[model samples]
Target: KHNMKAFLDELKAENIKKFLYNFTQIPHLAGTEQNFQLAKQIQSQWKEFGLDSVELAHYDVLLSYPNKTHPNYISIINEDGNEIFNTSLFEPPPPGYENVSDIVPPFSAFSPQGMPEGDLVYVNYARTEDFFKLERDMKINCSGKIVIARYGKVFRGNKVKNAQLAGAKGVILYSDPADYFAPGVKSYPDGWNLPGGGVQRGNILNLNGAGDPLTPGYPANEYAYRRGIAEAVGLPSIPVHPIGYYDAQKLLEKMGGSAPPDSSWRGSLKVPYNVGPGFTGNFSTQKVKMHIHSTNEVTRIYNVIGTLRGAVEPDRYVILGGHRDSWVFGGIDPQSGAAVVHEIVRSFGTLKKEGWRPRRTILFASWDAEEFGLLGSTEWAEENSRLLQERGVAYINADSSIEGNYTLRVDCTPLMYSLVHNLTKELKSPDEGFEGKSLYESWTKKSPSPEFSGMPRISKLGSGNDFEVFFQRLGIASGRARYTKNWETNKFSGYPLYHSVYETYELVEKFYDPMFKYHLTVAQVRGGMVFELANSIVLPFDCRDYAVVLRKYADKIYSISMKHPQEMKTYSVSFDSLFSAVKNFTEIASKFSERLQDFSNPIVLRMMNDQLMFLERAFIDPLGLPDRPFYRHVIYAPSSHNKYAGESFPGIYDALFDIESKVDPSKAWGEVKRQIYVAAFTVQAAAETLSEVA
Candidate 1:
């Protein structure tokens, strides 16, 4: 009665409590020395909890401190028909603002160094077609002017890029209340909102054309010296930043123009939004001693690694990874998942205590520096790329666990898709409602989001977390797990405090998850997933399912060709290669699957899992990707269009868009085929020795 099972259950419960307690006590934001120290403390806890070993993977990352010497942003406007002082305006200083009449109290984080004033020109979203229309109709010219565009309908980078293309001097982007931000507007926050002080700050790096400016085709190591700042290809030509409706509201209310920003462009503010060349004269801003300083700190950051040595198959590994870094206090996002993993580690220890050694080893990782664009995991994976490629079986990711007691929503390789389905149906949630269906389905069936009643729901797999390198680059079956009810419908749903000063335990407890019950659910699910993977005799990476998914992507590209016949030439070569690769790779995978049927040693099975976990790296070559070498995963990349976002099949998808821009329609037909063919190669390779036992 007092055996290992009982002990493990108790330990798991204790670990969950400990995870919550410890997570609340720490603040782990990026760009702070405190986070590095906190990471070490987190590692110490892992070791204290009986993990095998903990290591700190250190690297250099730049933190942009505000350039205080620059002239502050100033806006000029005729409020109440009198040139009243505008306190919230910052930017290219118009004479009115420089005359000291337009001084905003707090400087916006994204307000550029100096100021450049010009007559304001309004371009709707600064999209390609809008520019084309202006060129064709001779309707408007933005040369030597600051163009204002509302956020949405395009990536912010693309919008800025397009404005620059039109010879605009600077760009100011604001949230549109008509689309989403105001109370009646549903798409405001869902689209893109800067909150109250929403200063849109990001590196306007052109990710598509090349990679990192200083470290093109190489990692950003101080020793890996490459390009100079002047020659860096990704930096934006004109300074740009994002602003919220609150800031936009004060400025837009005073702008005078014949073309009030179209109702199509209006946002939540009750006052009229307009294109203001008629009122505010052109304002100018300049970089005040802008300099790039290397953030080379030898400070230690930890990756908590726990291994459960396999009883039968010691060589194979099932790795469940989630980062331990955060913007502030990470109680809900990574900490929620990390805490669950702590419980998982305790569960394994309990199993060992019970004489029930798993068939395969399980490795649980609490990755560091994840907030700064997957720094810790990417570097660690890079350093251990070969070994991971050789022995890793599968990687499950759990990030951004929220406050909901609903069904499971996941994005994964086919091998895992089925596994999750099986587990979801059999497993119970805290509310005990979504047992047999995915969290998405459970919420949908229960009518969680009243706005989305009777609509089909799907889990999207674009990148922003640890899963990027795992699944996109390696072809490994990767999964991101989180619990959310009808988030859109719930007032307290979604992570509103992402990457903000508000990302604290207090904020999480107040707005995101009050009781930490969702954290418990995450811990339970992570443990269950690890348990299933470690015990399975056959590797769960199913090639057939993989092929099916590849085919779907191929079809999507092909369909795009059909939809946009004019945009064909650019996509032809890449899509043709994609399809051809898929066909051949699928043939090879069939043989590999057949070959795997012959082996079944418990020891070998364990080792096989290790190899499977590492299978994600087949797509990577030691020479690494062309640019952004820190990001070696090629299959999935942050879209060239969106700087901080990930896209599936990035190369071919972008190539298709380019093809649409450059090639003849007839030739673009083969694009999907090429992508399919390329994807198939990786699928076949992932099956290496898997078919022998099948």
Candidate 2:
């Protein structure tokens, strides 16, 4: 019976490479004709590959686009009131890129159309602390200025939001040399570093809430109730534009103000890192401004969902997914993952042909509009929330599954921690030079868990890809696996040509995955995860793993509070209740793990599985988190500062950081206390679910 898993050996790197070439041949942006065509093609492919059911779920969502005739660009105004230079909007595709006919140019999606003119101010990375330092430490007021910021560190939308908070009029975002250009690496087409003219295009929507702006907490299917466009939140109020390092260099060298007082503020540009409000020659008259002419429309998008019915429990689902949409020629960010998904499907199709049906249902989704803030997955998840909560097993995400060659990285809800750890110990790594070296050994040697010494670390889930809605909103346990960069050698900007036209199959073949073995490894990992979860009678969940992380979160918070006592304002506010609750959960989980071995009767097995299924869901608070109402899971939510990343017990952690910025530190303490209790009860509720009471 275990031989049914032999489908792993059938995966061909050549087949995945073909899928990559096919998917990247067009600019299939969220609401484009190409993307919808891709959806239709996927629907047909899934059905033909022996899926029980396949459908294109449609949604009429609000989408934005740059003008085809008049592309957006930036202009530098001289003191004499003349336009000195205008940045180019055109981005030439690399040598072997197939379709350049309809590719969208680089501009932040959902940014309004306007020519927002002001003096250029350098706000490095546009992180919240960056702005705070600019105001409090440097005495530089960002008000009424057009800010120029480097990309990375945070979501692009929050960069604009942080700028807006600091009173900036407009923003120019660019990828910097330090982050993108590895010390000696050449530019794209030559090496993986972003070329001087390559721009990293992305959406600017507030990730705090996702999906269609019109349909806030529901699907955007036909006839679904929608709010007016005027009511849309998180859309950029001021125009935002993205240019490459070449354009950024042109603006930075001429800028004038004090040099960044902090050393971390400096980047790899040749010019001195100056904190600018305008050019030095004539501070009052000289300026850098963005001229954006983009259009917004109610466009239709498709989410192609295909299902493989189970042999025993048809309703219970083990979902696997990755987004199909990309920023431009998305070879690295998405199509890498998409190609991985397609290969997994093809292998699973081989299994289907062999009549190897699992015990639980399996769903493979090709999500649309994920590049525009998780619209496709969120809408679909929200629409099908009932069945998901009732019978959903877990979601495995494959977005950007191969970003680097360092080691396997898995970020997952803790319930499946041991499962991933055990599986990696058995699965062979992608190293072509080795004789089946286990991924676990390679991971432990390369990037061991930071908190658990000698243990290959699995990370906490956060909002970034299709998994956000399932893991964060509905509380379905989720996990993401990928071969990430060797952080020991490179910066987080390992793939500098990310989201750019330079991210093509040529680059993937030449620089990234020459043998395509990484993609095959990831596909097998995905297939194995789904196969194990789908075939289990008692789902492979470790309650003790969940309990340990919850306790770890408390320890981390405590240390952080001790390190910055003033910021924590914990003079009297004790997390004693929080600590005790976690202690209780830890003890309860150990008991629950022991109890699982005694379950033998059919009804007892069903009840026990139900408890395991709802364990993560027990953490959801109907009111959601502080300020981020769309996120209901109290333990894991995106930090208010960095939307793409997270802070464990985030409400409490973010509230403590709020003390540093808020006018009254005492006021934020109230929030800290409130959040502590919220998280405490949430963990307690999770523990209660694992109790022997039932």
Candidate 3:
């Protein structure tokens, strides 16, 4: 605890702010000269800070970019078939970056080129379940209609795919004011709210996999195998474009029809909030047109890596990473995180000056092109898959490390719940009037709802950030940390200028964290976690928590399995096996946890730590999940159906098993059985490993 406190004390907020300003000064999009330049600059900085080894890892891959010849646009037509409004398709450059011409336009990456026109229909949030409700309850036909959905609940690619599956001709997505704007707050430059003309730009790549769209299950290097873009699994076949709230409000105002099923479907817009098929009886001739143009080409991307080898066990590794590339300035998203990485390395340099050394190796990475997908991190992980699977202890990631000063948001494996819970109890809260209180103290006392669990509920990893490749693909224990405020001042909202030009250094200094105190606090938290993992005599992993989480998953599945006896019989599986396996695992893990504390022999300690490291690896099934082989983790994965939320028994829990599936169990019902056995066997394998030391 004393050593960790010394390390945390060395992290300075002024250094973080300085690095952020330097990194975001130039637009460093993937494959651009600025991107490679920034990579070299970080390499130089890391070398100057006295890191052991620093290198630039390169990959030949495919990336998408919009050409200046044709930009994306969205136009609305009124009752008489006359064009009413056409979006400018781009936000005015934020004040200081006025001459920046390389800013990517507002268009969805990987969307098929098309200019499709149809009568528009409104689908709230555009999640898969929202589409289900639209078809079943609202009685709206999406066939041939251009579906207009707000970007919130799901990935933008899922929005286009969902609309295409419902037989829509095109998809037009926009940021809703209800989501980005507070009740009485005005948009950006005026306040924290997003400007009416501010467009939120992002990639629409299918979240099914990460890395080069053409290269899956392998790296995108010179000698690697590859596939064609048309054969890519996650690419969308429909055209998609993004618009701002101003254009959305105009279109929604023109849409007059039956109201939504309930007020739960309402957005921040003041309009009637109708799930419209089109205009009312007399004004039914209106239509909307979507024009999108994007091109794909094979290019090269880079991963800037710096390593510090351990004195005792060089094979074992603790990694810290953040993406270096962004859509525009990337002020809040990647730059903030990139700054923290620099400061962490500098803090370690301070410890090195005092003759301190870690027990395990540490790697600090600045990934490229994460906005396009998890490209740089995914390819790098695939290139070192074998080495990582064997020796990787944990990968700590941060994309947007500091966005607000409200509270901490964490998503991690159950193995890390206790580590973070204990650490938060020691740190001071950044919020005002919470002066003498710790973060854990403030988090529990200020429950906005009754559902606040007594302790911090660590979330399961989902496919959103750079942690996906480390956790899902390679089965490494991984997580990310960020400071965010989802609700403030009686209104629910997120960072309004995500992936926009307005996410400037000005905004962070003024609105997000005025004093940059939260930024420093997050850095302290991140640095402490890394030091604890790298320097601990015994690895700080709790296997009992994993067993408890598995038990809860089994309980949920067991309760559901009883209602569908025929499906269970047809699949030839039962949750009884999983229940028994988790019980055995819990007993062994508890015994091992106690015995590990008493082990003094170096050989015995290494053996036990090795067993603990491979516990996560046992969750991977060589056959991988159905329809998504890139994700090999059987116990934890992105929801197969939704693609955003995490699923516990991913392959089985997300599978559809019906009492009538006796006719064809191969239609996902067979997958359910396969996944269940895989999970049970994995749990048993981990229990056996723990028994060796117990």
Compare candidates 1 and 3 on lDDT and give the better one: 3
For every model shown, what is its TM-score relative to the native structure?
Answer: 0.74, 0.96, 0.94
lDDT of each: 0.54, 0.83, 0.80
Candidate 2 lDDT over residue span 187-220, tens digit each: 8778877888888888888857657888888888
Q: What digit string (tens of lDDT, one per residue) describes model 3 on residues 283-349?
A: 6776788777788878888898899889799999999998999888888988988898899999897
Report how far off residue 484 is in candidate 3 (Å). 2.1
Note the residue pairs that clash in candidate 2.
449-457
Clashes of 2: 1
Greater-TM-score candidate between 1 and 2 = 2
lDDT of 1 by residue, 461-551 (tens): 5565676665555445566767655545323214333343333454445444556656655665566666777776776665555566666
Best by TM-score: 2
Clashes of each: 91, 1, 1
Candidate 1 — what's its lDDT?
0.54
Q: Pick the candidate with the highest lDDT.
A: 2
